[PDB]
Amino acid sequence: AETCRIEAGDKQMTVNMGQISSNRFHAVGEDSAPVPFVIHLRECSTVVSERVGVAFHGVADGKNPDVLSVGEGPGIATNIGVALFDDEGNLVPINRPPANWKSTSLHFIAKYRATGRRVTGGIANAQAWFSLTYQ
Amino acid sequence: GVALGATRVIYPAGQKQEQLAVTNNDENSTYLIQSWVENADGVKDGRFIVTPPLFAMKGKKENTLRILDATNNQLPQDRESLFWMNVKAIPSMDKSKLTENTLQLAIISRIKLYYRPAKLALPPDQAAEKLRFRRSANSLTLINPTPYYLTVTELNAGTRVLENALVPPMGESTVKLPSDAGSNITYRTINDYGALTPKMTGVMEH
Numbered sequence: 001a002e003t004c005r006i007e008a009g010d011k012q013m014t015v016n017m018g019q020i021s022s023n024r025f026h027a028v029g030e031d032s033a034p035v036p037f038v039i040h041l042r043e044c045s046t047v048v049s050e051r052v053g054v055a056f057h058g059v060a061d062g063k064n065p066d067v068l069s070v071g072e073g074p075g076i077a078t079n080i081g082v083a084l085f086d087d088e089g090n091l092v093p094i095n096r097p098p099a100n101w102k103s104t105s106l107h108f109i110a111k112y113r114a115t116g117r118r119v120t121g122g123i124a125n126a127q128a129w130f131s132l133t134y135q
Numbered sequence: 136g137v138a139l140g141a142t143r144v145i146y147p148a149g150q151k152q153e154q155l156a157v158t159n160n161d162e163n164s165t166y167l168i169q170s171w172v173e174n175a176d177g178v179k180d181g182r183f184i185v186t187p188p189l190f191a192m193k194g195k196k197e198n199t200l201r202i203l204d205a206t207n208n209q210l211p212q213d214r215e216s217l218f219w220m221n222v223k224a225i226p227s228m229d230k231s232k233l234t235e236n237t238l239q240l241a242i243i244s245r246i247k248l249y250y251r252p253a254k255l256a257l258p259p260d261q262a263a264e265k266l267r268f269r270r271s272a273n274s275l276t277l278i279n280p281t282p283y284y285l286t287v288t289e290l291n292a293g294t295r296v297l298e299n300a301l302v303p304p305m306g307e308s309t310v311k312l313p314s315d316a317g318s319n320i321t322y323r324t325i326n327d328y329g330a331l332t333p334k335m336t337g338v339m340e341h
Contacts, residue, residue: 001329002139003139003246004244005138006224006242007136011226012228013226013241014237015237016236017235037238047325047330057243125236126238127241128238128241129243130241130243131244131245132242132244134143134247135142135286135288
């Protein structure tokens with residue numbers, strides 16, 4: 001059997017996160033607006049797509065290991081990470097073992113989550129690997 | 136988008152290499168393809184070499200990954216050993232930088248790589264029926280007396296579906312039994328070709 005042909009939103013698999021308004025974050029753990037994205041599992045048997053576990057891997061924020069780091073440097077935002085959620089509002093912590101759900105479209109949500117007391121503005125890009133582990 | 140030609144690789148001991156197809160079906164997409172093998176714990180493991188380890192797929196095409204045995208014959212000869220084949224597809228198309236912040240994704244497909252000794256006596260297509268079961272009040276243990284990993288799925292106790300289980304060769308795996316689990320066990324497996332095997336009735340140990 002073939003594995004699933006994985007496609008995202010656009011062909012570049014880039015999720016547009018918008019812009020950071022630093023003065024909107026007031027407490028550690030506060031989340032910005034939801035950014036939905038979908039990952040499609042195409043051209044594979046339901047025998048296969050029903051039996052795949054998924055995980056997000058990346059460099060974690062230095063204060064919150066469950067969310068993605070936006071990096072460091074001049075003009076880079078501080079004290080926020082990129083948090084990932086399933087379509088039921090549950091956090092999907094990064095760098096965890098493959099996880100299963102119970103369809104060939106996985107709907108996720110990305111948000112900026114405050115990881116420190118005083119958030120500062122700037123560019124807030126993140127990178128992740130979406131891994132599918134086949135049974 | 137990128138797919139692999141199989142959902143597992145059976146590596147026959149003694150072969151210099153094993154092939155795995157990788158395809159892109161989209162004329163308007165280009166990917167970098169990066170491949171490597173991990174051990175059962177997910178740690179990159181040099182005992183298998185993948186060539187080419189990194190290459191470009193521009194548009195619609197099929198390519199062949201070659202997995203090379205570099206174990207120096209050190210793996211067990213009486214049972215399969217479990218590795219993970221990893222194929223990363225990096226979208227490599229000329230995008231344009233926006234004012235927008237972005238979350239950039241890449242995809243990794245991970246499939247089992249079973250190193251299979253030569254000259255095993257029991258045929259692979261007779262392994263699934265050898266599974267046995269041991270039952271307590273709150274748990275069910277699966278017993279695999281064969282040299283092959285068994286990927287057990289659609290495991291039912293009465294009407295209650297249980298967790299899937301990977302049962303190691305000459306080993307055991309345990310799953311939880313909910314309160315309403317019935318006494319009639321049935322199961323299937325995923326075979327060498329990624330297919331579901333026939334529904335079988337679970338036989339209790341001894």
